[PDB]
Design an enzyme around this catalytic site. Structure first.
Site, PDB file in Angstrom:
ATOM      1  N   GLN A  54       0.813  -1.211   0.000  1.00 31.80           N
ATOM      2  CA  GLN A  54       0.000   0.000   0.000  1.00 31.80           C
ATOM      3  C   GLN A  54       0.861   1.282   0.000  1.00 31.80           C
ATOM      4  OE1 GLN A  54      -2.703   0.327   3.306  1.00 31.80           O
ATOM      5  NE2 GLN A  54      -4.034   1.839   2.295  1.00 31.80           N
ATOM      6  N   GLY A  89       0.563  -8.017 -14.318  1.00 35.91           N
ATOM      7  CA  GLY A  89       1.246  -7.260 -13.267  1.00 35.91           C
ATOM      8  C   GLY A  89       2.758  -7.179 -13.400  1.00 35.91           C
ATOM      9  N   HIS A  98      -7.693  -5.556  -2.274  1.00 37.67           N
ATOM     10  CA  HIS A  98      -8.417  -5.430  -1.031  1.00 37.67           C
ATOM     11  C   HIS A  98      -8.542  -6.733  -0.225  1.00 37.67           C
ATOM     12  CE1 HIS A  98      -9.176  -1.532  -2.979  1.00 37.67           C
ATOM     13  NE2 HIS A  98      -9.014  -1.092  -1.744  1.00 37.67           N
ATOM     14  N   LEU A 158      -5.484  -3.514 -11.386  1.00 35.55           N
ATOM     15  CA  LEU A 158      -5.080  -4.854 -10.971  1.00 35.55           C
ATOM     16  C   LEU A 158      -4.450  -4.885  -9.557  1.00 35.55           C
ATOM     17  CD1 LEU A 158      -1.779  -5.635 -11.076  1.00 35.55           C
ATOM     18  CD2 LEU A 158      -2.228  -5.448 -13.539  1.00 35.55           C
ATOM     19  N   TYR A 159      -4.007  -3.720  -9.078  1.00 39.75           N
ATOM     20  CA  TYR A 159      -3.362  -3.602  -7.762  1.00 39.75           C
ATOM     21  C   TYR A 159      -4.363  -3.283  -6.639  1.00 39.75           C
ATOM     22  CZ  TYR A 159       1.615  -3.973  -6.630  1.00 39.75           C
ATOM     23  OH  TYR A 159       2.851  -4.446  -6.268  1.00 39.75           O
ATOM     24  N   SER A 187       5.145  -3.904 -13.613  1.00 40.99           N
ATOM     25  CA  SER A 187       5.991  -3.762 -12.424  1.00 40.99           C
ATOM     26  C   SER A 187       7.452  -3.584 -12.787  1.00 40.99           C
ATOM     27  CB  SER A 187       5.851  -4.982 -11.507  1.00 40.99           C
ATOM     28  OG  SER A 187       4.607  -4.991 -10.841  1.00 40.99           O
ATOM     29  N   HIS A 239       1.266   3.728  -3.506  1.00 36.41           N
ATOM     30  CA  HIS A 239       0.594   5.028  -3.404  1.00 36.41           C
ATOM     31  C   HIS A 239       1.462   6.239  -3.742  1.00 36.41           C
ATOM     32  CE1 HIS A 239      -3.424   3.938  -1.265  1.00 36.41           C
ATOM     33  NE2 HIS A 239      -3.026   2.963  -2.067  1.00 36.41           N
TER      34      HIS A 239
HETATM   35  C1  COH Z   1      -1.871  -2.639  -2.481  1.00 37.98           C
HETATM   36  C2  COH Z   1      -2.813  -3.251  -1.761  1.00 37.98           C
HETATM   37  C3  COH Z   1      -3.827  -2.394  -0.978  1.00 37.98           C
HETATM   38  C4  COH Z   1      -4.032  -2.400   0.348  1.00 37.98           C
HETATM   39  C5  COH Z   1      -3.281  -3.279   1.376  1.00 37.98           C
HETATM   40  C6  COH Z   1      -5.077  -1.430   0.652  1.00 37.98           C
HETATM   41  C7  COH Z   1      -5.609  -1.100   1.895  1.00 37.98           C
HETATM   42  C8  COH Z   1      -6.677  -0.244   2.162  1.00 37.98           C
HETATM   43  C9  COH Z   1      -7.193   0.177   3.466  1.00 37.98           C
HETATM   44  C10 COH Z   1      -6.653  -0.243   4.855  1.00 37.98           C
HETATM   45  C11 COH Z   1      -5.347  -0.174   5.125  1.00 37.98           C
HETATM   46  C12 COH Z   1      -8.236   0.995   3.265  1.00 37.98           C
HETATM   47  C13 COH Z   1      -9.081   1.670   4.371  1.00 37.98           C
HETATM   48  C14 COH Z   1      -8.430   1.133   1.829  1.00 37.98           C
HETATM   49  C15 COH Z   1      -9.384   1.889   1.170  1.00 37.98           C
HETATM   50  C16 COH Z   1      -9.146   2.578  -0.010  1.00 37.98           C
HETATM   51  N1  COH Z   1      -8.412   2.076  -1.075  1.00 37.98           N
HETATM   52 CO1  COH Z   1      -6.876   0.608  -0.843  1.00 37.98          CO
HETATM   53  N2  COH Z   1      -5.469  -0.869  -0.551  1.00 37.98           N
HETATM   54  C17 COH Z   1      -4.730  -1.429  -1.574  1.00 37.98           C
HETATM   55  C18 COH Z   1      -4.856  -1.103  -2.909  1.00 37.98           C
HETATM   56  C19 COH Z   1      -5.343   0.094  -3.390  1.00 37.98           C
HETATM   57  C20 COH Z   1      -4.799   0.852  -4.492  1.00 37.98           C
HETATM   58  C21 COH Z   1      -3.577   0.484  -5.359  1.00 37.98           C
HETATM   59  C22 COH Z   1      -5.698   2.093  -4.606  1.00 37.98           C
HETATM   60  C23 COH Z   1      -5.560   3.240  -5.626  1.00 37.98           C
HETATM   61  C24 COH Z   1      -5.246   4.541  -4.893  1.00 37.98           C
HETATM   62  C25 COH Z   1      -5.521   5.709  -5.799  1.00 37.98           C
HETATM   63  O1  COH Z   1      -5.690   5.492  -7.022  1.00 37.98           O
HETATM   64  O2  COH Z   1      -5.567   6.859  -5.305  1.00 37.98           O
HETATM   65  C26 COH Z   1      -6.697   1.965  -3.561  1.00 37.98           C
HETATM   66  C27 COH Z   1      -7.723   2.860  -3.285  1.00 37.98           C
HETATM   67  C28 COH Z   1      -8.375   3.032  -2.073  1.00 37.98           C
HETATM   68  C29 COH Z   1      -9.129   4.195  -1.597  1.00 37.98           C
HETATM   69  C30 COH Z   1      -9.358   5.528  -2.355  1.00 37.98           C
HETATM   70  C31 COH Z   1     -10.466   5.395  -3.394  1.00 37.98           C
HETATM   71  C32 COH Z   1      -9.872   5.375  -4.784  1.00 37.98           C
HETATM   72  O3  COH Z   1      -9.197   6.366  -5.176  1.00 37.98           O
HETATM   73  O4  COH Z   1     -10.082   4.361  -5.504  1.00 37.98           O
HETATM   74  C33 COH Z   1      -9.585   3.920  -0.364  1.00 37.98           C
HETATM   75  C34 COH Z   1     -10.432   4.858   0.532  1.00 37.98           C
HETATM   76  N3  COH Z   1      -6.442   0.779  -2.880  1.00 37.98           N
HETATM   77  N4  COH Z   1      -7.463   0.368   1.197  1.00 37.98           N
END
Ligand code: COH
Ligand code: COH
Ligand SMILES: *[C@@H]1O[C@H](CO)[C@@H](O[C@@H]2O[C@H](CO)[C@@H](O[C@H]3O[C@H](CO)[C@@H](O)[C@H](O)[C@@H]3O)[C@H](O)[C@H]2NC(C)=O)[C@H](O)[C@H]1NC(C)=O
Ligand SMILES: *[C@@H]1O[C@@H](CO)[C@@H](O[C@@H]2O[C@H](CO)[C@@H](O)[C@H](O)[C@H]2NC(C)=O)[C@H](O)[C@H]1NC(C)=O
Ligand SMILES: *[C@@H]1O[C@H](CO)[C@@H](O[C@@H]2O[C@H](CO)[C@@H](O)[C@H](O)[C@H]2NC(C)=O)[C@H](O)[C@H]1NC(C)=O
Ligand SMILES: *[C@@H]1O[C@H](CO)[C@@H](O[C@H]2O[C@H](CO)[C@@H](O)[C@H](O)[C@H]2NC(C)=O)[C@H](O)[C@H]1NC(C)=O
Ligand SMILES: CCCCCCCCO[C@@H]1O[C@H](CO)[C@@H](O)[C@H](O)[C@H]1O
Ligand SMILES: CCCCCCCCCCCCCCCC(=O)O
Ligand SMILES: *[C@@H]1O[C@H](CO)[C@@H](O)[C@H](O)[C@H]1NC(C)=O
Ligand SMILES: *[C@@H]1O[C@H](CO)[C@@H](O)[C@H](O)[C@H]1NC(C)=O
EC number: 1.14.99.1
Lengths: 551, 552
Positions: A172, A495, A357, A353-354, A499, A176
């Site tokens: 994450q 991926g 969740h 693809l990343y 990557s 980001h």
């Molecule tokens: C890599 C694996 C991973 C993990 C472990 C993770 C962990 C978590 C986590 C708890 C720690 C929470 C509360 C969330 C919740 C969210 N995720 Co992620 N996410 C992950 C992958 C992603 C990715 C990649 C994005 C895209 C971010 C962006 O485009 O701004 C994302 C987007 C989001 C967004 C922003 C909405 C959007 O722009 O699509 C929220 C809110 N989520 N996620």
């Protein structure tokens, strides 16, 4: 409707309308010819015959442990194999980049405008008779329906590869810096204009932000000392904007490079570690270079940390993900006699693809406590009260969720998962099978073949009707995983090219940059070339707790 | 002071300080070793023994016309030679780019910040005891003194290569898409964030400006029709800002992509020609694609014009400049089996070397008239009165000035020439001889060797004391030219690397773009295929007058 709606051109051929109801395919350099680029040239027939399947190659790399033990100890042979890993992956990516959400044909606007994510496949045309082109029903299944039937977690499914919470938060935190969707413009736009590993999530995207974060002494980043421990500075001190809901106390409003990192204490943990690391490298450079000023100490430390990041990503992170007995190597020199473009543009589909969740656990277990999502969010107190040493020890032990295989998205993030589906459609993604073909994979011929089971397949059959209109994102999450693996084939095959391209296509990997003098001399260069997830934690976290991406 | 001030590291080795009074050289991949990267590896010895000088190669390329006649007509050999030209020249340019005016060491800021011109050599350190490092006097000669003694025109010296005013205005129009110095920020900063051939001088640097120039019908640019002739639209109609004095009639305030192009009627001639070409290409594509909308028509025409531009620059413009009997070739396929980076960053020194103010004549001779600089400046009514056809006919016949060889900068432009020197020093450019070494030329050992004569050489010796602190820009203009040539060695050996790199680096030359579908199919592709300076004028200028880059 657009004459290319059916996606007639095969094997990377480009489709172009010629009049209102006709198309022509451009088969240039595809290795095929004929109307839809489906007739192979003779050398192509041979190549198709003499090419192993991804699943065959995966088998080879995940067996014969004793043979790989030999290979990994013959520098020449390790180098040869790593060379082939890098070249064969990277050629699947258009560089310079081509399409975007608004451009299904090549254009100067698509090339030059950095605010867009690029696109590996052009969007479905606006006037196509069905969402995916010509196949399937007039409407795709309700996204809520898809989510509830095949995506949402019933019982927690642990990752069989043993991925932990150190791994999940690293993923994450790292991703980001280059997935930073510009919600004000739309899902097809990004705020990461550096398009890669620039560490803007530590240093800030803009010069303004970098400068508010910097100490301007000794190359260093501003920081706080609380109970003898180094933490990021506050929003109040620095005037750096962060996303904190209105109830969080000012003292606990840490300011870091990326404005969203206050959301999760697991991100703030890595933000803190990397801040400490920058400042530690400044101390080292300062003794190598008592004559250097603040600006050069700062810039050279940034280059070293970029190098450390790539090193750790390849040799620890991707190493762990792959499951290979082969020992991967970060070595820019492998590409110096190869054709390769030292540039990168972040693809929308790579972002999609990343969206892993399913990695997220049901609760976050630190020391003797079990925090719900509600409790864990925005909770920097949790971090201060347990400390970084306990965070590392607890997260190193806690198992993450399996990503593929279906039904493993935690309910706490159901709205985010639904948004991934909805935003994919808004962006007019082509189908799963178009993406598989684009990356040299045979299309799936049924839902059972996709899932490797009967029950979810039957739900998806009822929802989509035709395998050829199955959507990319939900497919990645229900796909049959490799044996005892976190992911299935499509995830790895799409991926890996994205990557490795974005890692090796950093300017520090280029011949003019990959030299000890770039990094302040041999000491600086050695820091990069010996970096690991364990050394990052050992150097920067009190007590040097042991860590890794598994258990 | 900085321990690297004396520029101790040779052969493209890198210098870094190690302590207050000590340095180390990084000789990685230079082919040399030892303290200052001056001991050659064995293979390097062989290469250095065998490699012909630039002047030997120039001689061969400008003689033996009989053999070149053969070579030009055997496509395999022509391709082989052009491939070598492309790859050997490009190798001299750092890509991804490295230094800039603020960074004499590699940094993320210098790499990522597109507002800077990049630098082929790092700046001289702020604390060096001498302007050029450690050699020479504590001050460089007065810049006005250098200008007056060795640069200003006494009498007009014509280009012996026969370059004409069509050539001179093409150079200015073409290069001003990528040399757009941001004088608000300083001389080391650019407004041309595209860093190459994007045709922003036609379409506008920003989306906002582009949209104000566009018709939004048939892919076209807005225009006006005066006396039956197509010209660019006005500032009043478009709300596109241009640089014009207050007294210019509304209808003569022509709005084009580059805001300075109203300054000179010769620039507006080319702006008008390229605007007509864009709209002509829209008509062709609309005929091929009645199903296409305005956006795709516009974007596809723009890619076609980029291809046309690169094609003309290589096969007409650079061909003319070179004086070679070998026929240069624009063909992206040449690089498909080579190592090459499809990207570019504009170097400050490339801007500096391209200050070819001696090209300008004493007067602008159109039809029966001879116009002074004062008369010509901001004067679009001249263009309207004579028409484009007469502009072409007249400029095709008027000789341009010799660039090298000294004393040929017109007085009308003396303030610009002085600024070139002053800004070079402001940006802390290294000396001529450092730049010569950087581009693998032997350093000049005397001022007489530089000029090939005695009198200017003596003025320079008195001004500079030491040939090792002679500055790059004035040296380019006083250098002994190649026999009967417009330029000397230093102009060509520095300029050709930057030029070819920036022409081939463009994404349209990449294997994923260089395909007929990128250009709307075979028809769009063929427009690039046959483009020339002659066809450009023939297709867009009433009467299809003959033109070329040489007087005759
Ligand atoms: C890599 C694996 C991973 C993990 C472990 C993770 C962990 C978590 C986590 C708890 C720690 C929470 C509360 C969330 C919740 C969210 N995720 Co992620 N996410 C992950 C992958 C992603 C990715 C990649 C994005 C895209 C971010 C962006 O485009 O701004 C994302 C987007 C989001 C967004 C922003 C909405 C959007 O722009 O699509 C929220 C809110 N989520 N996620
Ligand atoms: C290619 C040869 C060439 C020619 C023929 C030419 C002919 C003429 C000409 C016609 C009568 C006039 C009025 C001028 C006047 C000027 N030129 Co040129 N210039 C030329 C090459 C350049 C270049 C290159 C620059 C730098 C442009 C920049 O950095 O923006 C320049 C800069 C200038 C500047 C300083 C402002 C600026 O744009 O930076 C002025 C004023 N001049 N020049
Ligand atoms: C690329 O490099 C440029 C040169 O460093 C840079 O421009 C500079 O931007 C900074 C930061 O915004 C300005 O400094 C500011 O600092 C304070 C505000 O905290 C003000 O009082 C100052 O007046 C100013 O706003 C510099 O003025 C500015 N330097 C210039 C214009 O030469 C660009 O920001 C960099 N581009 C990118 C995209 O980062
Ligand atoms: C490479 O670097 C130069 C340094 O520029 C040279 O140093 C010179 O050494 C001489 C010692 O007798 C001095 O007389 C001279 O002052 C000094 N030059 C300067 C400008 O400091 C090194 O000797 C040379 N090293 C090698 C191995 O060739
Ligand atoms: C990159 O593309 C975006 C989307 O077209 C551009 O953003 C638009 O800018 C125009 C002109 O200033 C505005 O009218 C719109 O409000 C913007 N649309 C958005 C934000 O979706 C952006 O300007 C482009 N970037 C560059 C440098 O041209
Ligand atoms: C070219 O590919 C196209 C697009 O798939 C093919 O187009 C047709 O093929 C069908 C079988 O003959 C026709 O019945 C259809 O009208 C049409 N396909 C559809 C459903 O749109 C075409 O056959 C291919 N041509 C070649 C040479 O293989
Ligand atoms: C033409 C622009 C005016 C320049 C006059 C001021 C500088 C005088 O310069 C002198 O000019 C003489 C005549 O060319 C030369 O013989 C001398 O070498 C030169 O020093
Ligand atoms: C992109 C603008 C082109 C202008 C060129 C600037 C300086 C002269 C370079 C061309 C020199 C003639 C020989 C070119 C071919 C070669 O020798 O590489
Ligand atoms: C956040 O976590 C802390 C642990 O330090 C917990 O006690 C608290 O209830 C949470 N914050 C609040 C008050 O919402
Ligand atoms: C501009 O050119 C015209 C000829 O078209 C000439 O008559 C006029 O005097 C010039 N303008 C100025 C202000 O010199």
């Amino acid at each position: 409707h657009h004459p290319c709606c059916s996606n007639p051109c095969q094997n990377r051929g480009e489709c172009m309308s010629t009049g209102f109801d006709q198309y022509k395919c451009d088969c240039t350099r595809t290795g095929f010819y004929g109307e839809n680029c489906t007739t192979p040239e003779f050398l192509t027939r041979i190549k198709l015959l003499l090419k192993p399947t991804p699943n065959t190659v995966h088998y080879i790399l995940t067996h014969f442990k004793g043979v790989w033990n030999i290979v990994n100890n013959i520098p020449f042979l390790r180098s040869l194999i790593m060379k082939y890993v890098l070249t064969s992956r990277s050629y699947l990516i258009d560089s310079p980049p081509t399409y975007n959400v608004h451009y299904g044909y090549k254009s100067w606007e698509a090339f030059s405008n950095l605010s867009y994510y690029t696109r590996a496949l052009p969007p479905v045309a606006d006037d196509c008779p069905t969402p995916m082109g010509v196949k399937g029903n007039k409407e795709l299944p309700d996204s809520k329906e898809v989510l509830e039937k095949v995506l949402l977690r019933r019982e927690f499914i642990p990752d069989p590869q043993g991925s932990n919470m150190m791994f999940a938060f690293f993923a994450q935190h790292f991703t980001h810096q280059f997935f930073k969707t510009d919600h004000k413009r739309g899902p097809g736009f990004t705020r990461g204009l550096g398009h890669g590993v620039d560490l803007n999530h530590i240093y800030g995207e803009t010069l303004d932000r970098q400068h508010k974060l910097r100490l301007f002494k000794d190359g260093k980043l501003k920081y706080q000392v609380i109970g003898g421990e180094v933490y990021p500075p506050t929003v109040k001190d620095t005037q750096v904007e962060m996303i904190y809901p209105p109830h969080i106390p000012e003292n606990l409003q840490f300011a870091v490079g990326q404005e969203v990192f206050g959301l999760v204490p697991g991100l703030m943990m890595y933000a803190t570690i990397w801040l400490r690391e920058h400042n530690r490298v400044c101390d080292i450079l300062k003794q190598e270079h008592p004559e250097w000023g603040d600006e050069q100490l700062f810039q050279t430390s940034r280059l070293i940390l970029i190098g450390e990041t790539i090193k750790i990503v390849i040799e620890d992170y991707v190493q762990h993900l792959s499951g290979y007995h082969f020992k991967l190597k970060f070595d820019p020199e492998l590409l110096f006699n190869q054709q390769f473009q030292y540039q990168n543009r972040i693809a929308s589909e790579f972002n999609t693809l990343y969206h892993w969740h399913p990695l997220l656990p049901d609760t976050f277990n630190i020391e003797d406590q079990e925090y719900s999502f509600k409790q864990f969010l925005y909770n920097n107190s949790i971090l201060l009260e347990h400390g970084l040493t306990q965070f590392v020890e607890s997260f190193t032990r806690q198992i993450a969720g399996r990503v593929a295989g279906g039904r493993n998205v935690p309910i706490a993030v159901q709205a985010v998962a639904k948004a991934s589906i909805d935003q994919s459609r808004e962006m007019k993604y082509q189908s799963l099978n178009e993406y598989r073909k684009r990356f040299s994979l045979k299309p799936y011929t049924s839902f059972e073949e996709l899932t490797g089971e009967k029950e979810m397949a039957a739900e998806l059959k009822a929802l989509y009707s035709d395998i050829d209109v199955m959507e990319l994102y939900p497919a990645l999450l229900v796909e049959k995983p490799r044996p005892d693996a976190i992911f299935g084939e499509t995830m790895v095959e799409l991926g890996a090219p994205f990557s490795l391209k974005g890692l090796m296509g950093n300017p520090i990997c280029s011949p003019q940059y990959w030299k000890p003098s770039t990094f302040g001399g041999e000491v600086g260069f050695k820091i990069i070339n010996t970096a690991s997830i364990q050394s990052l934690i050992c150097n920067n976290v009190k007590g040097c707790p042991f860590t890794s991406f598994n258990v």
